[PDB]
Amino acid sequence: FMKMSYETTCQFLTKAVLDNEREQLDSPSARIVVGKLNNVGTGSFDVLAKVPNA
DNA sequence: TGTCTTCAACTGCTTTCGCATGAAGTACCTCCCAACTACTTTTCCTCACACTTG
């Protein structure tokens, strides 16, 4: 997706499809394309909660 | 038989963000339309000739 979103979009698309490529959705641009929390900065980690069991 | 070299044709881009305010193509064709004039249209009106008379 980072290739697609710079230049020769269709050329990078063609080389991607011909590869049967899978996007691991790491590129910040690519991640934006899919509406995903950006992996940089505050999205570099996850937050969980400690909850009482009793 | 096998590998190598230059040139020219082809690909893709080369500031960002907004106002304005959108308009305008047009050949080939025309049927519709507006026109001037004349012609035509529907109801109505009023008189008239012949045979016969005496």
Swiss-Prot record:
The modification Phosphoserine is found at S27. It is found in: Nucleus, Nucleolus. It comes from the Eukaryota. Component of the RNA polymerase I (Pol I) complex consisting of 14 subunits: RPA135, RPA190, RPC40, RPA14, RPB5, RPO26, RPA43, RPB8, RPA12, RPB10, RPC19, RPC10, RPA49 and RPA34. The complex is composed of a horseshoe-shaped core containing ten subunits (RPA135, RPA190, RPB5, RPO26, RPB8, RPB10, RPC10, RPA12, RPC19 and RPC40) where RPA135 and RPA190 form the DNA-binding cleft. Outside of the core, RPA14 and RPA43 form the stalk that mediates interactions with transcription initiation factors and newly synthesized RNA. DNA-dependent RNA polymerases catalyze the transcription of DNA into RNA using the four ribonucleoside triphosphates as substrates. Component of RNA polymerase I (Pol I) which synthesizes ribosomal RNA precursors. Besides, RNA polymerase I has intrinsic RNA cleavage activity. RPA190 and RPA135 both contribute to the polymerase catalytic activity and together form the Pol I active center. In addition, subunit RPA12 contributes a catalytic zinc ribbon that is required for RNA cleavage by Pol I. Belongs to the RNA polymerase beta' chain family. Present with 2840 molecules/cell in log phase SD medium. This is DNA-directed RNA polymerase I subunit RPA190. It comes from Saccharomyces cerevisiae (strain ATCC 204508 / S288c) (Baker's yeast). The chain holds residues 1610 to 1663 of 1664 of the full protein.
